Design a protein around this ligand. Structure first.
Ligand SMILES: [Br-]
Ligand SMILES: [Cl-]
Ligand SMILES: [Cl-]
Ligand SMILES: [Cl-]
Ligand SMILES: [Cl-]
Ligand SMILES: [Cl-]
Ligand SMILES: [Cl-]
Ligand SMILES: [Cl-]
Ligand SMILES: [Cl-]
Ligand SMILES: [Cl-]
Ligand SMILES: [Pt+2]
Ligand SMILES: [Pt+2]
Ligand SMILES: [Pt+2]
Ligand SMILES: [Pt+2]
Ligand SMILES: [Pt+2]
Ligand SMILES: [Pt+2]
Length: 216
């Protein structure tokens, strides 16, 4: 009856996990179990982890092994986690994520400072490069003030779980490499609200990403 390995990634060691998955992106590693050049990975990982708030400073071969195994365990455990049964979830991100998603950077660059709303329809399937937390309610304070908001449509058989450290506060989490289909990007001028519903969505999002969470 072990606690979910997911807790290890969500707590105070988050910067180590976050920086590890960032390193996987930066080095184009296909899978966390298939890291051929340990030394180069560790070096990059350490660089990223020193810039986190709070700083991930104890990066080493031991910490490498710990993080890799934990990621492994999270995926091994995944089917045993409580599936979330909501139809939709929401996420707030800062503009930093434009650095991970070139389609988003482009759309932001083209849209920025326009006086009217703009949508761009998409059909792009991606594998998510993080373990991604999402909220049931877009009003949560950690979502509502962010520049970018995702609006997730959960398809039956999706991989979102109500499990871990903030499950009792409405957090639904998705696994590393979770499949999603980007269907729409929207731009919202200052003062404008998603779906023109300020009371639900506020006025702080400039960009909305609509996406579908696909079966596991
Ligand atoms: Br992550
Ligand atoms: Cl971090
Ligand atoms: Cl940071
Ligand atoms: Cl951070
Ligand atoms: Cl595309
Ligand atoms: Cl709430
Ligand atoms: Cl929530
Ligand atoms: Cl909630
Ligand atoms: Cl809605
Ligand atoms: Cl609405
Ligand atoms: Pt960070
Ligand atoms: Pt090593
Ligand atoms: Pt696109
Ligand atoms: Pt909530
Ligand atoms: Pt909250
Ligand atoms: Pt709506």
């Amino acid at each position: 009856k072990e606690d979910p390995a997911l807790y290890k990634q969500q707590g105070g060691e988050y910067p180590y996990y976050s920086s590890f998955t960032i390193a996987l992106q930066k080095l184009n590693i296909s899978h966390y179990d298939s890291i051929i050049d340990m030394d180069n990975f560790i070096s990059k990982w350490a660089e990223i982890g020193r810039n986190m708030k709070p700083a991930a400073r104890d990066i080493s071969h031991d910490k490498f092994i710990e993080v890799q195994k934990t990621l492994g365990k999270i995926d091994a455990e995944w089917s045993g986690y409580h599936s979330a049964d909501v139809n939709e979830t929401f996420r707030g991100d800062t503009p930093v994520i434009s650095n991970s998603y070139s389609w988003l950077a482009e759309f932001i660059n083209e849209s920025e400072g326009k006086s009217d709303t703009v949508q761009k329809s998409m059909d792009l399937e991606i594998k998510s490069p993080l373990i991604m937390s999402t909220a049931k309610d877009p009003k949560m304070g950690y979502v509502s003030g962010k520049t970018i908001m995702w609006h997730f449509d959960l398809e039956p058989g999706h991989a979102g779980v109500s499990e871990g450290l903030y499950a009792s506060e409405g957090e639904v989490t998705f696994p590393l490499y979770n499949r999603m289909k980007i269907t729409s990007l929207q731009y919202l001028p200052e003062g404008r609200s998603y779906m023109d519903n300020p009371e639900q969505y506020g006025t702080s999002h400039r960009y909305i990403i609509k996406a579908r969470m696909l079966p596991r």
